Amino acid sequence: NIRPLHDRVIVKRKEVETKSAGGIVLTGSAAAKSTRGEVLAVGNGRILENGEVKPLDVKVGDIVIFNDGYGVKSEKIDNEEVLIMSESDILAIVEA
Amino acid sequence: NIRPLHDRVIVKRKEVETKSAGGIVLTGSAAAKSTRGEVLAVGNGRILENGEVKPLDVKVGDIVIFNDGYGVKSEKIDNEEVLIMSESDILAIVEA
Amino acid sequence: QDELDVVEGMQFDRGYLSPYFINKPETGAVELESPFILLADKKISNIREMLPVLEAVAKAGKPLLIIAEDVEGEALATLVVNTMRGIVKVAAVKAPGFGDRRKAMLQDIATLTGGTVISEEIGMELEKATLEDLGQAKRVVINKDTTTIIDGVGEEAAIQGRVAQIRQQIEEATSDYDREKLQ
Amino acid sequence: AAKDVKFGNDARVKMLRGVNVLADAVKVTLGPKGRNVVLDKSFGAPTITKDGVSVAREIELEDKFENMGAQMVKEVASKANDAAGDGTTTATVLAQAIITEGLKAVAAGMNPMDLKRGIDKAVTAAVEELKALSVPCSDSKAIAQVGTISANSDETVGKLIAEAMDKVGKEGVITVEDGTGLQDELDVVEGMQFDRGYLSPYFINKPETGAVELESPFILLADKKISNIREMLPVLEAVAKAGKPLLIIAEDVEGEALATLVVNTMRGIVKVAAVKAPGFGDRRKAMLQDIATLTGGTVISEEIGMELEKATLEDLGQAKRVVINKDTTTIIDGVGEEAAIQGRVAQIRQQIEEATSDYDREKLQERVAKLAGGVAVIKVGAATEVEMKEKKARVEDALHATRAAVEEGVVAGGGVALIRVASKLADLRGQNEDQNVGIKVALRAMEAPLRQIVLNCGEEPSVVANTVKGGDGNYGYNAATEEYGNMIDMGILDPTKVTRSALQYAASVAGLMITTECMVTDLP
Ligand SMILES: Nc1ncnc2c1ncn2[C@@H]1O[C@H](COP(=O)(O)OP(=O)(O)OP(=O)(O)O)[C@@H](O)[C@H]1O
Ligand SMILES: [K+]
Ligand SMILES: [Mg+2]
Numbered sequence: 049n050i051r052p053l054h055d056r057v058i059v060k061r062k063e064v065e066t067k068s069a070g071g072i073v074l075t076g077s078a079a080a081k082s083t084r085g086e087v088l089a090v091g092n093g094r095i096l097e098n099g100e101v102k103p104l105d106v107k108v109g110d111i112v113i114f115n116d117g118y119g120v121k122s123e124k125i126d127n128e129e130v131l132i133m134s135e136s137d138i139l140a141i142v143e144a
Numbered sequence: 145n146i147r148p149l150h151d152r153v154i155v156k157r158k159e160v161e162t163k164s165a166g167g168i169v170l171t172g173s174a175a176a177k178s179t180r181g182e183v184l185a186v187g188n189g190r191i192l193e194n195g196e197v198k199p200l201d202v203k204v205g206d207i208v209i210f211n212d213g214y215g216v217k218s219e220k221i222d223n224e225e226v227l228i229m230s231e232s233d234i235l236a237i238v239e240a
Numbered sequence: 241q242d243e244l245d246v247v248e249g250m251q252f253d254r255g256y257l258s259p260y261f262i263n264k265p266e267t268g269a270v271e272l273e274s275p276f277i278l279l280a281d282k283k284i285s286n287i288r289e290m291l292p293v294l295e296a297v298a299k300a301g302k303p304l305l306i307i308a309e310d311v312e313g314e315a316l317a318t319l320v321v322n323t324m325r326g327i328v329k330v331a332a333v334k335a336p337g338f339g340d341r342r343k344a345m346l347q348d349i350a351t352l353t354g355g356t357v358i359s360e361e362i363g364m365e366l367e368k369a370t371l372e373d374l375g376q377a378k379r380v381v382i383n384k385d386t387t388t389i390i391d392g393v394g395e396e397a398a399i400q401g402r403v404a405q406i407r408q409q410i411e412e413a414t415s416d417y418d419r420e421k422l423q
Numbered sequence: 424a425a426k427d428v429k430f431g432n433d434a435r436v437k438m439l440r441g442v443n444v445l446a447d448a449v450k451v452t453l454g455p456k457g458r459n460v461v462l463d464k465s466f467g468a469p470t471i472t473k474d475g476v477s478v479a480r481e482i483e484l485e486d487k488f489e490n491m492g493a494q495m496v497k498e499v500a501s502k503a504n505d506a507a508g509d510g511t512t513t514a515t516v517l518a519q520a521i522i523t524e525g526l527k528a529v530a531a532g533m534n535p536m537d538l539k540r541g542i543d544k545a546v547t548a549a550v551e552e553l554k555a556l557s558v559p560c561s562d563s564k565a566i567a568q569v570g571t572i573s574a575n576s577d578e579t580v581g582k583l584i585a586e587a588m589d590k591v592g593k594e595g596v597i598t599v600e601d602g603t604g605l606q607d608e609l610d611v612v613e614g615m616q617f618d619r620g621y622l623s624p625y626f627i628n629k630p631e632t633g634a635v636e637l638e639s640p641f642i643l644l645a646d647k648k649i650s651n652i653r654e655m656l657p658v659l660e661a662v663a664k665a666g667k668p669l670l671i672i673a674e675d676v677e678g679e680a681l682a683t684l685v686v687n688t689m690r691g692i693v694k695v696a697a698v699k700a701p702g703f704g705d706r707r708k709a710m711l712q713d714i715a716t717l718t719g720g721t722v723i724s725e726e727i728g729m730e731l732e733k734a735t736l737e738d739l740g741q742a743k744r745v746v747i748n749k750d751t752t753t754i755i756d757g758v759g760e761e762a763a764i765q766g767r768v769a770q771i772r773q774q775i776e777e778a779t780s781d782y783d784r785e786k787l788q789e790r791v792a793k794l795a796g797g798v799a800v801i802k803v804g805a806a807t808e809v810e811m812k813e814k815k816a817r818v819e820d821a822l823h824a825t826r827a828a829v830e831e832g833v834v835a836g837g838g839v840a841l842i843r844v845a846s847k848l849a850d851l852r853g854q855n856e857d858q859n860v861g862i863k864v865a866l867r868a869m870e871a872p873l874r875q876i877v878l879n880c881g882e883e884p885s886v887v888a889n890t891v892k893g894g895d896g897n898y899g900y901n902a903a904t905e906e907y908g909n910m911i912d913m914g915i916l917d918p919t920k921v922t923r924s925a926l927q928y929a930a931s932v933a934g935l936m937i938t939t940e941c942m943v944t945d946l947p
Binding site: 258259260265266268269316317319321324384 | 592708709725726728766769773774777910
Binding site: 069083094096097098100102104106113115135136138139140141142143144 | 145147148149150152154155185187188191193194205217219223228
């Protein structure tokens with residue numbers, strides 16, 4: 049098991065949409081890497097200037113939208129690709 | 145449903161002005177991307193250094209003007225384009 | 241011996257952009273029965289632009305063909321994949337002719353097939369292109385060298401008006417090369 | 424520049440003199456007793472040849488009008504070599520005789536256009552009579568006879584070509600190349616035998632031969648070039664689970680992926696090897712797909728859509744044996760569906776029929792021979808370079824004659840087929856007397872190959888021509904033994920395609936050449 053530290057999240061990236069809205073199959077860069085992913089693990093929380101840890105607003109197992117860039121990192125846990133990013137890189141949580 | 149986190153807003157961009165002031169049709173670069181858009185979702189609020197969350201001045205369903213750049217992120221929810229920005233990137237609210 | 245080779249309707253000297261479009265492997269010729277015809281005045285590299293058009297074609301179910309400056313790379317591969325996936329019978333070929341003539345004979349193809357050419361100058365883009373915008377024909381043949389359209393579904397009045405316009409161009413033309421291209 | 428213009432009989436005499444120069448150079452080689460011609464080459468040693476097309480090509484005259492005649496009659500041998508590859512000397516002999524006898528009637532006041540029409544009618548009827556007289560040549564004995572006769576009565580060349588066609592079958596491709604020995608060598612290869620070696624020297628499973636042997640190996644076909652081990656890593660793991668060897672046909676395997684796979688090869692996890700893709704663009708894909716059809720697999724590419732990461736064992740091809748070496752690679756008993764193989768054969772044959780270029784068509788035929796049947800290479804063995812060139816030309820002519828024999832059939836050799844055709848066309852008549860005279864000069868010039876054969880033998884052409892015309896059927900003149908008998912029994916056969924093509928091209932150029940009245944050239 050892997051759990052992150054401080055204000056960071058371990059997220060498994062969702063499967064890329066192979067088919068478009070109206071049944072058209074998209075392949076290649078048309079099947080661009082999905083920025084949505086379910087949360088696999090939530091860290092303890094962000095450390096403020098006073099030394100207090102503020103728990104993250106993201107919960108384990110919740111689908112979230114994440115921003116790719118320098119803040120996201122790639123790792124292989126039990127031969128599965130996961131991404132690591134701070135809660136700032138997490139944009140929003142998808143509900144329903 | 146999508147709702148954001150921290151000091152950020154989910155905004156649906158308004159349609160580009162196809163017509164000019166005197167009714168001249170504007171196309172291409174003339175019909176540029178609209179900086180105005182209605183707010184679809186407001187986050188909980190900005191977290192300060194003390195650990196307190198200050199609620200955002202923006203409200204759901206209010207038209208606001210946003211600045212395009214690195215702070216805006218594009219996403220598709222129910223096959224509709226929505227932009228994501230921090231409340232700092234949100235410029236002003238259009239009233240009346 | 242002397243051989244006579246006659247063709248009818250639109251038949252230009254361009255082939256399919258990928259070998260995988262072939263519906264009839266025993267002849268190497270793609271045969272589209274009552275297909276849709278899209279006329280893109282710009283080259284195609286991405287799949288975003290005609291994605292609403294491709295979805296509308298998939299909803300209709302009829303085969304689809306593209307006449308564009310060049311459909312290549314990612315977009316071409318996407319059409320190929322959707323071709324053996326069977327959702328759409330899509331084939332794309334290079335637009336015939338060259339500058340200031342490719343546009344004219346593309347408009348001629350639009351007049352024959354009852355469609356409209358998608359161009360940046362004309363204003364409408366492929367994103368808002370619909371099934372009504374696309375052209376209509378009864379039969380279409382693709383092979384390595386030529387491309388034929390049989391019974392384009394277009395108005396006879398528009399066809400005759402285009403005939404008159406190009407005949408006026410013939411009469412105004414002075415050089416033999418332009419006049420014979422117009423003929 | 425300024426032009427010299429000659430009219431009528433003066434221009435005709437000059438043109439006929441040029442034709443006579445070229446045809447007398449060419450026709451000293453006709454028949455088995457015909458001799459060789461030395462052609463001076465500005466680069467290299469002179470070429471000793473017995474084929475009429477090389478002599479015809481090398482003839483160019485100082486007199487411009489005679490040079491016109493030479494070039495026009497050289498077109499006969501050029502076309503006869505392009506179409507059938509044999510009978511260039513016979514075509515030039517026929518063309519010269521039609522021009523000579525045709526200009527006799529032109530000087531006799533008869534209309535040259537009607538003479539040309541009569542020649543065309545007579546030669547159309549002659550082609551019909553040659554087709555009727557032809558017998559199909561499928562047995563190996565007649566093929567050996569055709570190859571022997573076409574190679575200046577060299578029985579070794581004929582028997583070697585017969586054995587080669589027997590080995591590679593009807594769909595096989597046979598080519599002639601130089602050899603390092605003094606003797607003729609036949610090299611027959613089966614299955615896909617593309618000329619690409621291993622990408623690294625360390626793949627060698629059999630160090631005593633330098634050849635990698637793979638027993639029942641998996642085959643992966645990567646249309647794209649790969650430089651990273653990531654893409655076929657699922658495929659590598661799957662084939663390691665299977666344990667069978669793997670061969671990659673790729674555009675290029677280099678760098679990290681190549682190093683990883685050779686390391687895994689000598690670690691023993693996978694007996695893997697990678698080679699370059701055959702050919703270049705627009706031909707690499709088609710015969711890569713042919714390899715996939717032979718091996719029962721599918722090519723991995725971006726255009727087709729699936730990636731190497733998604734490629735599985737079912738995607739990969741299957742074969743029974745694979746041989747890698749320094750220059751080429753052979754695949755033996757590729758496990759593919761027979762019906763798909765024959766469908767691919769039919770598709771490439773349709774491409775051949777649609778092909779209007781000799782290079783593309785010969786590449787397609789080579790691909791057909793690779794996927795189905797075999798490929799034979801005949802190494803011409805000769806102690807010296809000039810003998811190598813002469814023997815290579817003779818074997819090439821024999822190969823073209825055997826190909827024309829299986830294509831169209833065979834007839835009696837030595838010009839007796841044309842003699843029988845002319846005897847059958849005795850009652851043919853044109854629209855007027857000039858056309859009848861043109862028919863008659865065509866029939867008389869049909870005796871020219873036999874007469875020139877007898878002239879090269881040193882005997883009297885007229886006596887032998889009358890003796891052959893007196894006989895019926897395939898009775899003719901053995902020019903090697905200077906005897907008489909059934910030429911089919913005597914083994915002297917000529918391809919019907921060769922004789923018919925020679926007659927047709929000679930007749931066309933000769934008729935258009937006797938129709939002339941004025942000739943306009945550059946002044947000296
Ligand atoms: N032993 C033979 N007896 C009778 N005729 C023969 C004999 N050997 C060859 N011929 C004939 O000699 C003729 C000429 O053959 P040859 O190979 O010399 O030249 P070709 O067919 O005119 O063309 P090319 O010069 O291009 O090879 C053929 O028609 C062939 O039938
Ligand atoms: K000869
Ligand atoms: Mg010969």
